[PDB]
Amino acid sequence: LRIIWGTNVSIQECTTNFRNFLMSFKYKFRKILDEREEFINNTTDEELYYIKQLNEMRELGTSNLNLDARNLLAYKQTEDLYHQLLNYPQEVISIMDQTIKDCMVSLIVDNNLDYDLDEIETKFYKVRPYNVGSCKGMRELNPNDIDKLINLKGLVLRSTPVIPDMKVAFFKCNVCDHTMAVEIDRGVIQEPARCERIDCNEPNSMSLIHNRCSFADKQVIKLQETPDFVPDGQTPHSISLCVYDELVDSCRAGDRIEVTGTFRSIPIRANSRQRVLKSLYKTYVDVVHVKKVRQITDQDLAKIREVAAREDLYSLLARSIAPSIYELEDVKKGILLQLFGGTNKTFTKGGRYRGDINILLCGDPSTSKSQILQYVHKITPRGVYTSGKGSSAVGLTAYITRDVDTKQLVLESGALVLSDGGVCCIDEFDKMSDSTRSVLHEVMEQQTISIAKAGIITTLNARSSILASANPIGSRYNPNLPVTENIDLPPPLLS
Amino acid sequence: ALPSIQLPVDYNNLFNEITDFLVTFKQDTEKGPKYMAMLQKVANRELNSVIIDLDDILQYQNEKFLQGTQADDLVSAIQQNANHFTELFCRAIDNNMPLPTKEIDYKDDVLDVILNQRRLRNERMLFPPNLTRRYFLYFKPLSQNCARRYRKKAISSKPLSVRQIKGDFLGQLITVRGIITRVSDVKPAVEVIAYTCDQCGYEVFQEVNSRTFTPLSECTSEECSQNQTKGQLFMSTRASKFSAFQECKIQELSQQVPVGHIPRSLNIHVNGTLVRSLSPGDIVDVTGIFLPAPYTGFKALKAGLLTETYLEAQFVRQHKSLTSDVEERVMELITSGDVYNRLAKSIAPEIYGNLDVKKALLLLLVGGVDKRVGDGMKIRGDINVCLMGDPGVAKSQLLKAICKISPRGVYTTGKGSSGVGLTAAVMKDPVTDEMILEGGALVLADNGICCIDEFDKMDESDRTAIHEVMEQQTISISKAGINTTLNARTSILAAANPLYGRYNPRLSPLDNINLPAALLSRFDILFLMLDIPSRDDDEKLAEHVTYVHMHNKQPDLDFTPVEPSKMREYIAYAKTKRPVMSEAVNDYVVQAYIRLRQDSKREMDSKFSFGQATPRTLLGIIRLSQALAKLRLADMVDIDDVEEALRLVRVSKESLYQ
DNA sequence: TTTTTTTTTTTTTTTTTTTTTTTTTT
DNA sequence: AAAAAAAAAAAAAAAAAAAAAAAAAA
Ligand SMILES: Nc1ncnc2c1ncn2[C@@H]1O[C@H](COP(=O)(O)OP(=O)(O)OP(=O)(O)O)[C@@H](O)[C@H]1O
C-alpha cells in the first residue's frame, strides 16, 4: 500500500514476487527465456537451481549470492523488479536482504528439524548482483545515471589501507562518569546537550572516548581506462571505487577487473575552514560485486598414483614439458630432473647442505634455448623470468628504495628472493655486469643475501635454482677452441 | 550611491519581437512556423537541444521591412550582448511550449516521480523553472553569404585568432580559429539544489549562478517555524538538477604567430549536449560568448582589477566502412592491373629510384599471419625492415612518407626525446598530481608501423624494449608496484647510419654499424643503399630535382600517381583478408631452405653475406609470402609467390655489394 | 697502467600579502 | 548590536653548479 517517499518501490509486492521467483524458478524457465536453440533440457529443467544453492548455503552457513539480471528478467511477473532495481538499487537491495532474512526460515522448518536458527538470527545476509546491463567504459558516463547500477571495466592501479568509519559514538560524563551511546546519521554527530541523569544534570560536561566507539572497515581503489578502448592522442582517465565489508582486500594491484556498483556524486569544500562549497561535484562508484578479467581431492590422488605406475614416466614428461622442441631430449631430461630437486637437509653440526640443481645452456646463437626457458617458467609453481642484460646491480636481491606515494622507506625484495623454493630463469647470462655477478656468487654458495643500508642490517633467504641461457662471441661455437674463450664467463662461475 | 545612465535599449519591445518571431516566422524556401515544429518535437522527449539561427532572425527582419514597419535590429542586440538574451529566449520558449501530443511514456524518471508526488500533497493540503527544463539553447553565428545577400556586414562569425581577441570584445558573440590541445573529462555541475528537511514541510530548492555556493541548512517552512532546535538541511541528489560540463584549451596556429613571439592560448567551457564535440588534435572554428572569469579566492588580491577570461561555446565547425562504393573501388583497382608495381611506385613519387625498397615497404605495410599455436606457442606476422646506407641517399624522406599511408604509426627519433622505451608508470599530471600509467610509442602502435629514425644514436635503454618486442611483443611495465604486461604487437621500420661516414672496404657488415649481430638477425629484411658515383645517374637525378624547383609540380611522366585514398582503401581491405596455405606449397619451401643452407655452408667468405642462414630465415620467407599473397590473391597461396618472396630476399642480400 | 673520459646525484619549500570572511568581547 | 583581534591562502620546480664515484682507453 504505502510507498517509500521519493521512489515508487513498495515492499509488499516485491517480497511476494521474490519468494515466488525463488521457489518457482528452475533452469526450465531460464532456457525458455534465452531459447537460443541447442538448449539442453536434460533433467536440468527440474533441478531447482535456486533452492539447491539455498540449502547448500544453509548447511555451509556462508552468505554469498550471485543473483543475475537476465535470470531476474526471466520470470514474467518479476520483470517489474528488473527495471525497478536499475533506478533504485539501495531500496531494492534493502528489500532483498529483508526477504533473505526469512528465506532461511522458509526452508529450515519444512521438515521441522532442530536447527538453532539463533546464529542465523544474529547473522545478516546480502546479495551481489552482476551482469546488470550492457558494459560501458568510464569514458561514457553522464550525470543522467547518478544513483543507478552500472557495470564498469578497468585496470587496478593501487589500493589503500583499511579506513575506519564511525558507527556508534560514545560519550562519557566527566562528573558523574555516565556512559551513553549516540548513533550517527550520514556522518554528522548530534551532540548530547546535557547529561541525561536528572541528578547530575550539568551543562557542558561531555567527553568523547575515541577508542570506545564502534568502527567499520572501508577501502578505496583506483582504476584506469583500458588501453584497448582509448582513441588516438588521448590520456587514460581514472575512477575511484568504494569497497566495504567482506569485499575489502580482494583486488590486487595491476589486475584488470569488471565491477558492478552504484554511481554517485558528492560535493567537496572550497575552503578548508569555511562552510563554503564549490559548484562542481566529484563522481565515484560504490561497488557491490567484483570479478576478474592445493587442496587436491582423493580422485586426484588416485589418478596421480595410477599415472605414476606408468612403465616409463621419464620419457613422457620428457616430451611433455617442451612439445614444440624437437630432439634435444637430453636437455629436457636434465630440466625434468631439475624441477624436482634432490632432498634438502640441515643438520645441526655440519649445517645446511644444498638441494638445488643449476643448469647452464650455451652454444650456437640461433637455437631454441629462450623458448625452453619460457616453457619451464610456466610449469614451476613460483618462479621469475627476467633477463640479465641490465637493470640494477642488486635487481635480483633486496634494494632499499624511497616509496613513491609516501615519503617513506620500503624494503623491496629482488628476483632471487622472490623465487625462493622454486626455479629462477636467467636470460642473456653473458651481458650481466661484473659488479652484480658477485651477488649471484653469494646466492649459489650460501643461499642467503645480506643487505646493510640506511640503518638496516639484515639477511634474506634465496634457496632457489638457477637455469641460465647464454650466447657466445661470434656467429658460431667452434669446437676447436675450448669453452672458456667463447662463453666469456669466469671459470668459477661456469664451474 | 549608484548613479544612473540612459541607454537606448529597452527589453520590453525586444521581448515582444521575440514572441512575434517565434510564432510568425516561416521558411520561405512541412508547413507552418519553423520553430513551433521543433518545439512540438522537443515536447515528445526526443530532441534535447534548441539551436537558433541569426540568418532566420534576419529573415524575419527582412519580412518586416517588406511590410515596412520598424524593427529593433535583434541581430545586433544579440551580437553586442548575449548572456541575457539566452534567458530571454528560454522564458519565451517556456511560455509557448506545446502540449505532449503522443507517447507520454512515464516509466522510471525519478524527477518525474518527485514532481508527480508533489502535486497530490500540494493540492490536497513556484519552484525554479530551470528544474523542469530539459532543452539546451544555443546560438548559431551569422553567415557571410546571407550577410552579403542583405549587406549589414558581419562580426560574430569572422575567424579571429587567440591573439586578436582584445578586451573590447568582452561580452559579445565571436568566433575563434585554432587547434585543440587539451580536453578534460565530463563532470556534473549543479544548477538547482534540493534539500530534504526532516519531514518538515517539504524539500527546498536553491539556484546556483556561480562556481561556488553555500548550503542553506535551516528550515524556514511554516511548520518548521516552531522554536525547538531540530536539525539542519541535508542535500538530496535525486531531486537536484545537474549538467554536463567540459573545459578545453585552444592554441594559436603556427601560421598566425608573428616572428619572435610565443603562441597564446584560450579557455573554452561547454555545457549541455554540445559536450564531447571537440577532441585533442583538431583544427576547428568555435563560436561562443567571451566572458570574464571572477579570479577570486587566493592570489586575487595581488591582481586587484585583473581578471581571467573564457569562452562559453555554442557552435562547432570542424574544418576537415563496408559499402557498395568501396566494394566497387577494389574491383576497379583490380581491373586497372599492375597493382604491385604501381602501388610500389606511387609511394613518394618525388624520389626517383630505389624501386625494390618501395616493393619491400609495401610488404611491410601489409602484415603476415599471426597464428596462435596451442600449448603456448606463438608466431609473429609483423615485418621488421631495416634500411642502411650512406648519408644523403634520401634516407629520411622515405620513412616519413611511409608514416602517411597508415594511420597507426609513430615516427620516433634519437635521444632528443625518449618515447621508444617510455613505458613509465609515473605521470606527474598537473591537474591532479597523481600517477598515471603512461605507455610508450612501441605500445601505442598496435597493428601498426613504428618508424625509428636515427636508430644508430638511440641508447641501449631503448634497445632493451626493441629486443623484447621482437621476441614476445608484450612490454613489461615499470616497477612502480603494478606488475603489468601490455600488448605491443607492432612492425618495425628502422633507418640506419653507418659508422664514421660511408661504406668502408672493411669486409664485415658488423664493422659498418654499431648494431649487434643478434639485433640485426631478428630483423626480417636488411637493405643497403650505398651512394656510388656514376656519371649517368647524376644527370637524371639533377634534372629530376631541378624540375621540382622550376615548376612546383612533379615532372609529368607516363607513370600515373594513384589517388592516396585508394591506396588506403586497398591497403586496409588487404589487411582484413586472411590467407590460407596448402601442404603442396610448403614442400618446395623445404627444398629452397636446404639449398640455401648448403649455399651458406660455403657462402662464408671474406666480404659478402652476413653469417649463415638460420631457421628464422625460413620463418621470414613464409612471413613475407603472406603479404605477397594478401596483395591480390586469396585462399591458397601460389607457388610463384614463394619465388617472388625469395627474389626480393635475394636482391636485399645481394645489396651488400651494391 | 695511469691516465683521460663518463653517469649522476641531491641540491629544492620559511615564506606573503592586504582583503575577505570568521569568532570573541565590551 | 557593535568593536577588536586572528588567522587562511600559499605553491613548486625546473635549471644550473659542484663533487664522487663506477667504466672507458695511449
Ligand atoms: N633518389 C633520390 N631522389 C630524389 N632526391 C634524392 C634522392 N637521393 C637523395 N635525394 C636528396 O636527398 C635529400 C633527402 O635526404 P637527406 O639528405 O635530407 O636525408 P638523409 O638521407 O636521411 O641524410 P642525413 O644523414 O644527412 O640525414 C633531398 O635533398 C633529396 O633531393
Ligand SMILES: Nc1ncnc2c1ncn2[C@@H]1O[C@H](COP(=O)(O)OP(=O)(O)O)[C@@H](O)[C@H]1O
Ligand atoms: N629446435 C627448434 N624447434 C622449434 N623451433 C625452433 C628450433 N630452433 C629454432 N627454432 C625457431 O627459431 C626461433 C628461436 O628464437 P629464440 O631461441 O627465442 O632466440 P634466442 O636465440 O635469442 O634464444 C624461434 O622462433 C623458433 O621458432
Ligand SMILES: [Mg+2]
Ligand atoms: Mg636525414
Ligand SMILES: [Zn+2]
Ligand atoms: Zn553526568
Ligand SMILES: [Zn+2]
Ligand atoms: Zn523543517
